[PDB]
């Protein structure tokens, strides 16, 4: 073993001169021998410790027109790339720019050596990422995504993922070279799990970029990623889900989504907390202002599945904020919204939803829960149970808190949205006579009248609306007059908002 190293060390200087010789017959033979040397452990340690030999190998690979000489030098460099010290020699000898040129080779063996060596450098060699980028390696790797060897594609896509992570420039290059369509096509075509996994990781990295994200959606990546949501490989499923969640907010104009939504609803019952989390967040965005998707989600038992997720989640706002938001969406503005409002009750959802209004809930989850209750209150069968769970005193208490703040962004949420939301929910709960006795008995009429002076139009409308509902009973109509409500309601008659003026007239009539 030690005598092998001595023999190699002495041969190398002479082998170096022959390898960088004019005569290509000399060079071919020298390169074949250098490759044979690089297979044995002792003599390859000698090769990587000679900077001039490694340079000769790199120069010859760049320059040769002989196929056997391309294969041997590339194989030599590939053997050196399994060791830290060999990686450093390749880097220091301008071997990254050379290997990037070889990614354009028509010789498949050279291509396969070049990508695997480059993969080794990208994993283990400080500086290798900037060098590959600098050499224009990304444009070339993207062009290679139309090859059909699945193993070569798995390594190519992993090189793309390493290079794109945390680098805006590499994401845009990938996009400018047709990266999205090629990646999405791979997901639509192959079944090799290693390749699906690496490709899904590139798409995950591109899905946070705001130029790439729309491009992935247009190519059908939403539907392509959905195809693998029940694969036995968990790392594949989780990557597809993380990616779908990033893309979800730009996919609301998309169609042929029936299969994806169906599977997301089934995934809400996973015992994996990251799966449930992504399924909830994706569903919340895909139901947002999309009546077609809402109908499909309700039809496959989405309400039950979402209520069960809120019950399991507890004080986990990462899960409840999106789940509640999806329920909010499914309970308004489509054919089956009445059925959905009833369904939240029938599947044990009312007690748990009212509880989410209470601490330690934060303002994003409170804003959305208030909104869900507002929708649920459109269905008369929820009026009574919602009263029983304590929704009214708590909505009123949040309204006082948010209004007092607006005189004397908290947690991401504007306090005016909480005033509009809570009063809006009280506006609709006040359709029940029993609710009117609770609301009024909490000394709310003074504050509702003071809200008529609010500059924001949406708050005027909602405050006038709840005042309008309360006035239908006589004793309440007198307390509204006594609070000096006549003046501000008269000035609200001449409003550009049609609803504000309507409710304002209706209050004035019922005070006589």
């Amino acid at each position: 073993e030690q005598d092998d190293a001595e023999l190699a060390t002495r041969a190398i200087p002479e082998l170096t001169k022959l390898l960088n010789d004019e005569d290509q017959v000399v060079v071919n033979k020298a390169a074949v021998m250098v490759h044979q040397l690089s297979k044995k452990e002792a003599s390859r340690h000698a090769i990587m410790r000679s900077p001039q030999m490694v340079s000769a190998i790199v120069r010859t690979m760049q320059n040769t027109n002989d196929v056997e000489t391309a294969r041997c030098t590339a194989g030599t460099l590939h053997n050196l790339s399994h060791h830290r010290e060999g990686l450093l020699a390749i880097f220091k000898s301008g071997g990254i720019p050379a290997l990037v040129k070889m990614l354009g080779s028509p010789v498949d063996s050279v291509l396969f050596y070049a990508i695997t060596t480059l993969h080794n450098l990208l994993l283990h060699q400080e500086g290798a990422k900037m060098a590959v980028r600098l050499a224009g390696g990304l444009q070339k790797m993207v062009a290679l995504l139309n090859k059909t060897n699945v193993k070569f594609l798995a390594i190519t896509t992993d090189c793309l993922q390493i290079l794109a992570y945390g680098n805006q420039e590499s994401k845009l290059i990938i996009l400018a070279s047709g990266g999205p369509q090629a990646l999405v096509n791979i997901m639509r075509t192959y079944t090799y799990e290693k390749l699906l996994w690496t490709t899904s990781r590139v798409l995950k990295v591109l899905s946070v970029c705001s130029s790439n994200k729309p491009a992935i959606v247009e190519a059908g990546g939403m539907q392509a990623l959905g195809l693998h949501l029940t694969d036995p490989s968990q790392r594949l499923v989780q990557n597809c889900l993380w990616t779908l969640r990033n893309l979800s907010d730009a996919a609301t104009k998309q169609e042929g989504m029936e299969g994806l939504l169906g599977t997301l609803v089934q995934l809400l019952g996973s015992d994996d907390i990251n799966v449930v989390t992504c399924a909830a967040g994706i569903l919340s965005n895909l139901t947002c202002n999309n009546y077609k998707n809402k109908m499909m989600v309700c039809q496959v038992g989405g309400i039950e599945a979402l209520v069960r997720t809120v019950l399991r989640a507890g004080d986990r706002e990462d899960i409840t904020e999106p789940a509640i938001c999806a329920l909010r969406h499914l309970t308004s503005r489509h054919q089956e919204a009445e059925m959905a409002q009833n369904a939240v009750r029938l599947h044990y959802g009312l007690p748990v939803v009212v509880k989410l209004l209470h601490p330690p809930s934060h303002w994003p989850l409170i804003k959305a829960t208030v909104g869900l209750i507002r929708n649920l209150a459109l269905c008369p069968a929820n009026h009574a149970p919602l009263r029983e769970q304590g929704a009214i005193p708590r909505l009123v208490q949040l309204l006082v808190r948010a209004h007092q703040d607006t005189q004397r962004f908290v947690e991401g949420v504007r306090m005016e949205e909480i005033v509009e939301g809570c009063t809006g929910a009280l506006h609709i709960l006040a359709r029940d006579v029993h609710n009117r006795i609770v609301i009024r008995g909490l000394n709310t009429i003074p504050l509702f009248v003071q809200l008529l002076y609010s500059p924001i139009e949406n708050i005027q409308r909602v405050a006038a609306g709840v005042l309008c509902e309360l006035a239908q009973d006589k004793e309440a109509a007198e307390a509204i007059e006594a609070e000096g409500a006549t003046a501000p309601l008269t000035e609200l008659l001449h409003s550009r908002n049609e609803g504000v003026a309507t409710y304002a007239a209706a209050v004035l009539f019922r005070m006589s």
Binding site: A11, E14, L18, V25
Partner: peptide, 23 residues
């Protein structure tokens, strides 16, 4: 050419000599 032909025969002979030492 003639001069370059001698360069080849010697250079290829150097290679076979090295290949005996190593293999």
């Amino acid at each position: 050419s003639q001069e370059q032909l001698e360069h080849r025969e010697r250079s290829l002979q150097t290679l076979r000599d090295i290949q005996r030492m190593l293999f």
